[PDB]
Amino acid sequence: AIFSDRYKGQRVLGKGSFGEVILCKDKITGQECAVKVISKRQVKQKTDKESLLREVQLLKQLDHPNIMKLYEFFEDKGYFYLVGEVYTGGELFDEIISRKRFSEVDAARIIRQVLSGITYMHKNKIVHRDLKPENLLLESKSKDANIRIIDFGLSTHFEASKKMKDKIGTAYYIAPEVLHGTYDEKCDVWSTGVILYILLSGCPPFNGANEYDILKKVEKGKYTFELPQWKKVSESAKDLIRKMLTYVPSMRISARDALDHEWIQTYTKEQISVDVPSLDNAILNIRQFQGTQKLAQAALLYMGSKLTSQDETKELTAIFHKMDKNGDGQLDRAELIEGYKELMRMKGQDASMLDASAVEHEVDQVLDAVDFSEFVTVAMDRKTLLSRERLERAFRMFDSDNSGKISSTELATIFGVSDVDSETWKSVLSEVDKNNDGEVDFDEFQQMLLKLCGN
Structure with missing residues (x-):
C-alpha cells in the first residue's frame, strides 16, 4: 500500500x-x-x-x-x-504560559497524566528516551485538557539528528545513563522529574550557557532547591523530585511507584485546591523559559529554511534552464509542473508535496500569484513563509514588554541555547550595526541570522 x-x-x-x-x-x-x-x-x-x-x-x-x-x-x-x-490543544507549556495562576494541584494533575501514560508503555516494554515538554500535547483547546504524549x-x-535545529531543548531532559550508553525505561522517569522541576520553579535543574555545559551538569547529576521560588513548594513535591532524579537508575523510583507517591495522591484531589497558593514566580520564569526556547528554535529554523531556499532556488533555475530549448517566452504551465516535479523527484516526494497532484496545485498557487522565470522567486519565498512568520512572531512573543528590542544579554542567552558561537555572533552584530548600543530590533536580529548562515 x-x-x-x-x-x-x-x-x-x-x-x-x-x-x-x-x-x-x-x-x-x-x-x-x-x-x-x-x-x-x-x-x-x-x-x-x-x-x-x-x-x-x-x-x-x-x-x-x-x-x-x-x-x-x-x-x-x-x-x-x-x-x-x-x-x-498545542504543546502543554504554551497553554501554561497563557494562564494567570498555576499551583501544585495543577502540576500534580499534569504529572499524574504523564506518569499514567509512561507506566502503561513501560508495562509493554516501550521506552520513550526523548521525553520533553514539546512531546506533551493537549487533546483540545479547552481548559485542563487531556495530555497526549507523542513519539x-x-x-x-x-x-537522533546532530543538527542543532533539531536538538533544541533536548539536553535539559536527557537522563545521564542515556549519555553513557546503558539505559532502560527508568530514563523516562528522570526526564519527567526534570519536567516537574521546571513546572514548579520555571527553571531547568541542569542549566548552562550551551549544550555542552548543560550536558556536563546532567552528567554530574547535581541540582539544588535553592532558588527563592522553591520556598513556595511542599516537601512532598521535593521528595518525589529527589526520587525521580536519583542518579543510579536501579535506585530511581519507577513510574508506577511515582503514581503512588504522597504528592500525587495528595495534590490530585478536588478540595485541596482551596488552600494551595499560586506559584506566580514559577509562571513568570516558565514564560521566560518558553519564550527563549521558541525564539532560539525559530532562529535556527529560519536560518535552515534560508539555506534550503537558496539550494532549491538554484536547482530549480537550472532545471528550467535545461528544459528551455531556446530563449525566454518559455513559461509553460505543464513544463513548470514538469520542472517542479523534477526538483521534487530528485529528493523524492517530500512532506509539503507528497503527491504528483500536490505539485500541480502548488504551481497553480504560484501562477495565480503571477498572472498568465519570475516563477522561481515567488515559489521559494512561499516555502520559507512559515519560518519568517514564526521568527517575527517568536521575536514579538519574546519581547513581552513590547520594547521592540532584544538586549545583548538576551542575545547571549538565545544564541547559547541555539549553540551559536559567542565570538561569531558578536562579530556579525558589528557588521550589521557598527554603532549598536547593546540591543537590536527585529530587522537587525534578522540581519544577524542571515549573516550567520552565509547570506
Whole structure:
C-alpha cells in the first residue's frame, strides 16, 4: 500500500523529532490524521527492519488516554510515514504560559497524566528516551485538557539528528545513563522529574550557557532547591523530585511507584485546591523559559529554511534552464509542473508535496500569484513563509514588554541555547550595526541570522 494513494496532505503542522508533521485526510473516509514523515536521507535507522516492523505492530494494538494513538505505518524508498491521531490543544507549556495562576494541584494533575501514560508503555516494554515538554500535547483547546504524549518508541529505531535545529531543548531532559550508553525505561522517569522541576520553579535543574555545559551538569547529576521560588513548594513535591532524579537508575523510583507517591495522591484531589497558593514566580520564569526556547528554535529554523531556499532556488533555475530549448517566452504551465516535479523527484516526494497532484496545485498557487522565470522567486519565498512568520512572531512573543528590542544579554542567552558561537555572533552584530548600543530590533536580529548562515 502507498501512503499518497490513501491520504492527501492538507496543511503542514510543523517540525517534529525525526521529521515534519503533516495534517492529512483519508481520501475515502474523510478521517483527519497527523502524519509524521521521516526522511531516510536525514535520519538513518539503528535497528534491523524486522524489529521496527514488530514494534510498529505492537504500537498499533496499544491504547491509553495519555498516549498518541498510532493508526498506520507506511514506507517507501525515501520516507517512513507514521499516521496518528490529530490533537489541536498545542504543546502543554504554551497553554501554561497563557494562564494567570498555576499551583501544585495543577502540576500534580499534569504529572499524574504523564506518569499514567509512561507506566502503561513501560508495562509493554516501550521506552520513550526523548521525553520533553514539546512531546506533551493537549487533546483540545479547552481548559485542563487531556495530555497526549507523542513519539513513544521512535528513539529505539532512529538515531537522533546532530543538527542543532533539531536538538533544541533536548539536553535539559536527557537522563545521564542515556549519555553513557546503558539505559532502560527508568530514563523516562528522570526526564519527567526534570519536567516537574521546571513546572514548579520555571527553571531547568541542569542549566548552562550551551549544550555542552548543560550536558556536563546532567552528567554530574547535581541540582539544588535553592532558588527563592522553591520556598513556595511542599516537601512532598521535593521528595518525589529527589526520587525521580536519583542518579543510579536501579535506585530511581519507577513510574508506577511515582503514581503512588504522597504528592500525587495528595495534590490530585478536588478540595485541596482551596488552600494551595499560586506559584506566580514559577509562571513568570516558565514564560521566560518558553519564550527563549521558541525564539532560539525559530532562529535556527529560519536560518535552515534560508539555506534550503537558496539550494532549491538554484536547482530549480537550472532545471528550467535545461528544459528551455531556446530563449525566454518559455513559461509553460505543464513544463513548470514538469520542472517542479523534477526538483521534487530528485529528493523524492517530500512532506509539503507528497503527491504528483500536490505539485500541480502548488504551481497553480504560484501562477495565480503571477498572472498568465519570475516563477522561481515567488515559489521559494512561499516555502520559507512559515519560518519568517514564526521568527517575527517568536521575536514579538519574546519581547513581552513590547520594547521592540532584544538586549545583548538576551542575545547571549538565545544564541547559547541555539549553540551559536559567542565570538561569531558578536562579530556579525558589528557588521550589521557598527554603532549598536547593546540591543537590536527585529530587522537587525534578522540581519544577524542571515549573516550567520552565509547570506
